[PDB]
Symmetry: D2
């Protein structure tokens, strides 16, 4: 029943559901079948960085993903988020594995949201930055297999003692406080998110991916959303 | 049972419990009997601004209160907050009225918290800014008589339709997300808070005050904490 | 010879050079003949707010202008700033009067610029905020008739002792430090500017306007750029 | 003739001028003879981080220096900066070598300054962050042997082609824009600086150190200020 808007880092393409034949970054609006995609030259075992931006004037959701010493990949999609999401939402990170696997490690995550009203100097804002995750992270709602504190990192999916990633795993982390993305008097609403990740797999075909998402505040992991469903969607429709 | 650290803007001095004979700003550490106070030339009906700062290196809690076109009042107290408060806390605003009354209106509130670890570029941070309050403020926990949306403001205590403040009222507003003020690897922890208020009363002796406070995450208004207890303390001890 | 990109608040339309028949907001790219315009319901004597945003991924310059209690005006233009401006630029405010006049008062101005590289956590940033201007503002380059300190405000054009605006006046204020808007390794470059202004005139036809601009670092007021040229352009071509 | 306030990371103690017998961090107020010092367990070849903080209410300059996986060193000194420095200043980094040497590499540098007035919401601020230095850094004033762009870093002292540090070298980098640290209506003025450095030397006795400093805007490297004088002082008095 959840309303999901997500930017996915898809490591394992599922050609049967519309995905192109290569790893890619995509913009999902209420469906795992990305509205827009871009080729992503994913690097197994390297730390990458994803930047997501949006503003209510342009109504364009854009994302850039890069690795040090390499060219970046970019994808954009024209979408009015006020027509898709509710006034109050929660933001988070999600990841999954299935028959194929990979570590879905988050080393840092920052988010800034601003609502500027027509009143003079009337700016509402929220900003959080995690460069370090502790074992008891009270400002995060951890769902599924997600855990914090392992090396000061956030492990979205299960990783065994020896560091090996596990299959059929799903986990998400949402910021505790709801985020206001629309107000009747707002002249401009905008946000920017940044996260660094480490996707590693002993396999030649790692899976399934990581996604930054925005949802209704009471969002929970849908049943059997491991694998291609990224812990965000109930089905492949 | 709550653990309270507060900076109070005391409009009605209670000489019977140690308060000096004039309105004052004070620093309360687990007791309504301020550890330190400073004369405050309170102005009925004018908008004022309070700034509170602290850092774990200096271990000094300081606050400054001012009104436009006037000199400010300042108070400081040497206190190691790690020895008083738990690792995770919630921050908020509290106010009360008793036999004497006043409006306890908050027009804006900002807070910034930073935890810097010994790891290179390892900074965790939280920042929120409210310059406008809407009727349904989901990122705030409103307790007691506190309400939002009235003129885009936060009314900590009850105010009737005609704008007149009510007696025997108590209310608090806490930010939804818990705040991390200590971590084993932190080299410096600091915060700064700023809020603008409007205290107005048709009476010559307005009461009782507004306080910025930090407490255990599950803090609630103590029984019969109206009046001099500022919705923070269970007794005058 | 200067390279100018500007967002103008045009109070006096010059139909002879292409302007629509009403006050408007426009986006100027190296010419006073706006590439794009939008109707602006200017209010004589009221304080307004302008917000300008841009990012290198979307390559879209957008601006929103509003007044309290009123609907806002918005204008956007698709332009790659890297193809127009040099790597290093200076940002500022400009205003002019001619036969017709108005006060071109700036009460506040903020600017944030970010350059994010492909290196992990490699973010360069610049941010300044002026909510108050002092008589000797060393971090601003004042050109022409611009002065600071009058009521803690920045007066872009000459205003006499009695508060009356003067005709045939031109002035600009640029931030002292050059701003970096492009780097070979940058994956995303973005900026946002906000300023509050007070345009007042004893006349029914106030003139000429205020503009936020970006230019080459050594930019100076072109000869005879009073009136319609806004202290930015050498001619009306 | 310059007015200097500095926080030094002294790698080579000069017992003849008062320094303790070990590497240390010190707070210098117009003299190379530190007002206060603290033992610093310097690590040759490791990247460290220094944090400096101050505010006009407490009038206490504090600094913390740390390395990953190690305990930090801290030093504080009670000093009213308004009684030492002029209203407008420039901030920067300085370093030197003499008969003994070391690399004085800066990998990142951030600074935030705030001036809060008694007027409602009257906050002036300046913030810059360098996580990357380019060959032509126009927003920095480089003095002496200082250069940028080498590996995206700032080399305060001369380093040859093969990476070996050179002796008798001195260099400084100041932020281009002057910084306002006092205003007649300011109720609180504060700043915080953070920089990461890499001090490496092929020698067992590296020298001489790095210092974060604040000075009059027109400050220049004093004659023969190599070695123990850190490019900041004209003599050892």
């Amino acid at each position: 029943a959840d309303t999901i808007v997500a930017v996915e880092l898809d490591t394992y393409p599922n050609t049967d559901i519309g995905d192109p034949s290569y790893p890619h970054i995509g913009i999902d609006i209420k469906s795992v079948r990305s509205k827009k995609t871009a080729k992503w030259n994913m690097q197994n075992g390297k730390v990458g960085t994803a930047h997501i931006i949006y503003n209510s004037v342009d109504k364009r959701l854009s994302a850039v993903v890069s690795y040090p010493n390499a060219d970046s990949a970019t994808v954009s999609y024209d979408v009015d988020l006020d027509n898709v999401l509710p006034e109050w939402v929660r933001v988070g990170l999600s990841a999954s594995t299935g028959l194929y696997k990979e570590t879905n490690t988050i080393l840092s995550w920052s988010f800034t949201s601003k609502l500027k009203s027509n009143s003079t100097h009337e700016t509402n804002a929220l900003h959080f930055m995690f460069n370090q995750f502790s074992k008891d992270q009270k400002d995060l709602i951890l769902q599924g297999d997600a855990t914090t504190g392992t090396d000061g990192n956030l492990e979205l999916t299960r990783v065994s003692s020896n560091g090996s990633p596990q299959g059929s795993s799903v986990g998400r982390a949402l910021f505790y406080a709801p985020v206001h993305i629309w107000e009747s008097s707002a002249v401009v609403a905008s946000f920017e998110a940044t996260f660094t990740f480490l996707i590693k797999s002993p396999d030649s075909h790692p899976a399934d991916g990581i996604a930054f998402f925005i949802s209704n505040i009471d969002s929970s992991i849908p049943s059997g959303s491991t694998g291609r469903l990224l812990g965000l969607f109930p089905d492949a429709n």
